[PDB]
Amino acid sequence: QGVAVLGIALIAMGEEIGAEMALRTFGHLLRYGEPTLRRAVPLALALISVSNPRLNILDTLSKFSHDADPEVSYNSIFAMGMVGSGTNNARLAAMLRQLAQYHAKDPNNLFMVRLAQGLTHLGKGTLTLCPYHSDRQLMSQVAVAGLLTVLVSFLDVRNIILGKSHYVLYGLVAAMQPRMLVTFDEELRPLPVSVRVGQAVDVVGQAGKPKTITGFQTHTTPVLLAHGERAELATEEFLPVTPILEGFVILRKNPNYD
């Protein structure tokens, strides 16, 4: 059943509504499920929300990380570390340290919570592993490979990890990748530029040219975006070579007219 739920997750990873409601279904599973399914669910929650620490999912993961079953607690704590992966959210870190305080007498749990803070602080929040990519369009094959290896390993945390082998986290590290917007122009010249960044708006269907930027936060070129926010650059300063601004980009210095 654990692998079955993990496969449900490994089928539902894209569509936002489907992922949200797969999380709802996984909560149903955890509540009205066996202890095996209970240990399984948090991993699937992480799969759905990788590096996407939403308040509701964090609440659920903490809920079922303070669970009596050590395996359930292990799965949930690592899942919460993953959903916090490379985000450094203050609320998440505070909850993490409170949970570490609470689990003061549990050595393996303390180990896992330490790794959870490490995940929350990945590269000090500069590198973020993500299956999805390109405005939730591109599938990261190597990233999914590594993530699935890690989560299969954690399907049985007690024996697989709390023992000899614990380097599937290094496999995940190899699977790591950044989220960043260097506008290195022609000849890799680090041409700076003001970019208006805001949470995506699902441009489809809406009126006119939808303002994909929510909460305009003009922050020059060296920005990190976020799990689900996109950029609109500026009025006409430059002409980007791509409309899906991400990573290494080039900005043609050919505005039609200032």
Binding site: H66, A207, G208, G215
Partner: protein
């Protein structure tokens, strides 16, 4: 076809939801814990180690220190596992526990609900490049409000004072509120809108307080952009005549001015003053030591009208081709708000023609109607 498919599938969803509710059964009634588990025994234990009261510390008398605390029970206490003695501050909110009353945790200052929700931390959904007809005014505002903040070493090298205080004035509806929203959205600093009505209360004592707490809040925050609106409402001509009973508003205005610039630095607070009748404004407030760069919004010219027209045409379902400069020509002496209403009228005319295209004909009809009314 498609509509019937919708209705069917949404019926299926409603049935599914009611089926879930009836089958499993989740509700609250009076108080509830719907989220499973929530066991909080350790929470109870630490609550007992805590669940402290709070008061306002008064003075640290001696250099073991003697903190003085006032509420329904006075006290003189000190010492705690807490450090940073009194966080180098006296009039805080101490947050001290019971049981020998010497353990503390600092707290922010109490502030009345009015200012609490006037903080208006939301970000209005407007951005530059959506403004036409006031390029010079927006240039001035951008300069004053950004150069001191964005790469401002160039602004300090020249040894020139940083302007602080701008009053937007003009005819009723020119994009002043729009530009204020745009600046609010773009800026990254403690932004605080203010409504004049909320500063008028039952008799003396209220406005002056709320103003003072607002100002100290702004001072505590690193750098503030305050956005008074309704200045015409708050603060007027100082003359009494028959206002001998109405002197409350004048008093509040006087305290406002004193906090703006009195016998103390006012701080890194930049003030925006929205108005449309910039004559009854009191001379003391209008003093350019407090409103440095008054900006005037005028009716847009032809190019501004065209730019606003295309901006509003940003919306879809519009004609493939429209000739906006003639649209602007047909609407002279028209506010940008009137351009917006013309686009709205064109949409409504398309609807009342059952047309999913907003044609230049629709625009002409809307212009004719608005002009005639």
């Amino acid at each position: 076809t498609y509509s019937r498919q919708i209705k069917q599938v949404e019926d299926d969803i409603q049935q599914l939801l009611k089926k879930i509710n009836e089958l499993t059964g989740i509700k609250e009634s009076d108080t509830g814990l719907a989220p499973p588990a929530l066991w909080d025994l350790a929470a109870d234990k630490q609550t007992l180690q805590s669940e402290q009261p709070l008061q306002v510390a008064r003075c640290t008398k001696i250099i073991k220190y003697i903190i003085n605390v006032k509420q329904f029970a006075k006290f003189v206490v000190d010492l705690s596992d807490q450090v940073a003695p009194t966080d180098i501050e006296e009039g805080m909110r101490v947050g001290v526990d019971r049981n020998k009353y010497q353990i503390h945790i600092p707290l922010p200052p109490k502030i009345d609900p009015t200012v609490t929700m006037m903080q208006v931390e939301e970000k209005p959904d407007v951005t530059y490049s959506d403004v036409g007809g006031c390029k010079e005014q927006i240039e001035k505002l951008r300069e004053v409000v950004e150069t001191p903040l964005l790469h401002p070493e160039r602004f300090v090298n020249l040894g020139i004072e940083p302007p602080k205080g701008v009053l937007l004035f003009g005819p009723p509806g020119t994009g002043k509120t729009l530009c204020a929203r745009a600046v609010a959205n773009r800026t990254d600093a403690c932004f605080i809108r203010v409504i004049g009505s909320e500063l008028v209360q039952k008799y003396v004592g209220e406005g002056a307080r709320m103003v003072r707490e607002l100002f100290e809040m702004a001072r505590t925050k690193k750098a503030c952009l305050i956005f008074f609106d309704e200045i015409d409402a708050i603060g007027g001509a100082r003359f009494d005549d028959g206002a001998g009973g109405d002197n409350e508003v004048q008093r509040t205005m006087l305290e406002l001015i004193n906090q703006l610039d009195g016998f103390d630095p006012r701080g890194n607070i930049k003030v925006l003053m929205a108005t449309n009748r910039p004559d009854t404004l009191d001379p003391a407030l209008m003093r350019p030591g407090r409103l440095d760069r008054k900006i005037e919004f005028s009716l847009p010219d032809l190019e501004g009208r065209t730019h606003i027209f295309k901006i509003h045409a940003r919306s879809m379902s519009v004609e493939r081709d429209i000739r906006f400069e003639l649209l602007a020509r047909l609407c002279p002496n028209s506010t940008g708000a009137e351009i917006r209403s013309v686009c709205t009228e064109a949409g409504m005319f398309a609807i009342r023609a059952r047309r999913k295209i907003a044609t230049e004909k629709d625009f002409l009809e809307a212009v004719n109607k608005v002009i005639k009314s």
